Design a protein around this ligand. Structure first.
Ligand SMILES: O=C(c1cc(=O)[nH]c2ccccc12)N1CCN(c2ccccc2F)CC1
Ligand SMILES: O=C(c1cc(=O)[nH]c2ccccc12)N1CCN(c2ccccc2F)CC1
Lengths: 304, 304
């Protein structure tokens, strides 16, 4: 019993973290095989940050200008190239700690673990969700760029995120491991609009199922609703519309608890319209949306 | 910017997790040097669980009855002994992945990371606080016993907790790495009273300082209070009394923010007496107490 915001064990990713220095800027790199991946803004100066011409800036850089250090050993850079907003630094040594890995572009609403790093060294690990507006509510300081987000499937690490930026609003933006930003964000020190961030309904429902499995059942009511009636309430409260796909993914949790999805939707409807009245659910006084139905099943069944 | 419930990177601890089987029971063990540490209730049968005579049960067990497996390789047990509620299984091979480590008995109110494990394999990592009533609000299932709690100081892992039990109330109990239970708990399947759990005031204040540093300043008021006046409010709301030591530890956060500790106490007093009025602080609708002043400074300064 118990329900926590659980991150994946970070060991396989710690063995990939390196420090990348270019000129006077230092950030984090991800060493997989003979390649180090890092944000391309490592080549910027504090003058270039407002609107950098990365192609021009990279042209003034040679392999010897990229200092890559893993622990205390220097890696020799034999190639460099820009792929979207990431630089791929080819090194002469394959990382002996390279785990079985994939590069995946996650969907909004999906979750992942972040290993925050500074100077190539891991400082902490936390669980995040890619918001519907493609930002993440992380915890990042100067030098955190190049820290990665990931998921683990037994022995395989799926890298989904690389940290690039913090918007003036305190929210975080970044790319997949091919350098494509999640959302409309660009890697330049400018004010950028993060759109309206909605609540991930399927995750709030999955977390209501986790609450039911872990003893918290006060919010359960004698009501039911329809997809269309529930969605009228979800629209008013800036919640993602629930689809039949979402109902289907909630199927295992519905079967385990014996509470139909639309019955849980009716409980959520009343929680939105009436609030919590000073009560809590799984130790929280608000509706949590950073646990997918997969996260709930995994935490409530103990998948290692 | 940003503030998350951040766990330590778990790699150094993952390299220590083993599976320990005795008879038909399997749980987790911690392999450091040539010793595997695990809960002694690994030697219990489902008949023994209500009141086991561990000394008698251990006497019917020999080295060959303890099956220790690290990954897929079997370790050879050359010695066994009970130290309080843990068994120390001497193996013929020192763990090549043994990190620099210490065994520490943490204080109530202090925090630590848990690497939840099943069958010697890590499933997840989360941050916990040792409650003033010596329980932890973890996330643990069958087979999770032997999972450890820890802190890291650069390269040194301080092991502070080993998971043993879940009380009928859904809260968790366990020992330090010498087998001494935190609290009055005993390792037997009986109803055990977890005392009244108070709120860790110094941590709630540290988290109010984290909120101020991260833009959330709505709760700041034009008031001040005294230690004795604040403590009259802390008593009424089941909060730990604030001491001058707590004020001193809050010193760096007070200096960084320019808000005196007693001024922050006055804000907390009003938050307790008036509630949140539907607002949030660092994304939470309740007062968070699982971040020590050290955790706040570390997360807000980026210590790796
Ligand atoms: O390391 C950071 C940073 C990241 C973060 O998430 N939070 C912070 C909080 C306080 C100070 C700095 C940061 N940055 C340097 C590189 N920055 C950059 C972006 C685009 C183009 C050039 C650039 F140099 C983004 C900012
Ligand atoms: O693995 C667990 C367990 C631990 C947990 O924290 N949560 C659970 C939730 C559901 C089912 C089991 C658990 N237990 C087996 C060993 N138990 C035990 C304690 C004292 C004496 C003998 C014993 F066998 C404690 C219970």
């Amino acid at each position: 019993s118990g329900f926590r915001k659980m991150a994946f064990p970070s060991g396989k990713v710690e063995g990939c973290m390196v420090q990348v220095t270019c000129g006077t800027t230092t950030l984090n790199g991800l060493w997989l095989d003979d390649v180090v991946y890092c944000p391309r803004h490592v080549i910027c100066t504090s003058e270039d940050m407002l609107n950098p011409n990365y192609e021009d800036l990279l042209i003034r850089k040679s392999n010897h200008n990229f200092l890559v250090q893993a622990g205390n050993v220097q890696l020799r850079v034999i190639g460099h190239s820009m792929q979207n907003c990431v630089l791929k630094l080819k090194v002469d040594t394959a990382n002996p700690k390279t785990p079985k890995y994939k590069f995946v572009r996650i969907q909004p609403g999906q979750t992942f673990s972040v290993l925050a790093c500074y100077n190539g060294s891991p400082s902490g690990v936390y669980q995040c969700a890619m918001r519907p507006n493609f930002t993440i509510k992380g915890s990042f300081l100067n030098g955190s760029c190049g820290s990665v987000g990931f998921n683990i499937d037994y022995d395989c690490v799926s890298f989904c995120y690389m940290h690039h930026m913090e918007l003036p609003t305190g929210v975080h933006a970044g790319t997949d491991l091919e350098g494509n930003f999640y959302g409309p964000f660009v890697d330049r020190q400018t004010a950028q609009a993060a759109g309206t961030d909605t609540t991930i309904t399927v995750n709030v429902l999955a977390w209501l199922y986790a609450a039911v499995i872990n003893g918290d059942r006060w919010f359960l009511n004698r009501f039911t609703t329809t997809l269309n009636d529930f969605n009228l309430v979800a629209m008013k409260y800036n919640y993602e519309p629930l689809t039949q796909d979402h109902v289907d993914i909630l199927g295992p949790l519905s079967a385990q608890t014996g509470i139909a999805v639309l019955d849980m939707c009716a409980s959520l409807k009343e929680l939105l319209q009436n609030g919590m009245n000073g009560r809590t659910i799984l130790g929280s006084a608000l509706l949590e949306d950073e646990f997918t139905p997969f996260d709930v099943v995994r935490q409530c069944s103990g998948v290692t």
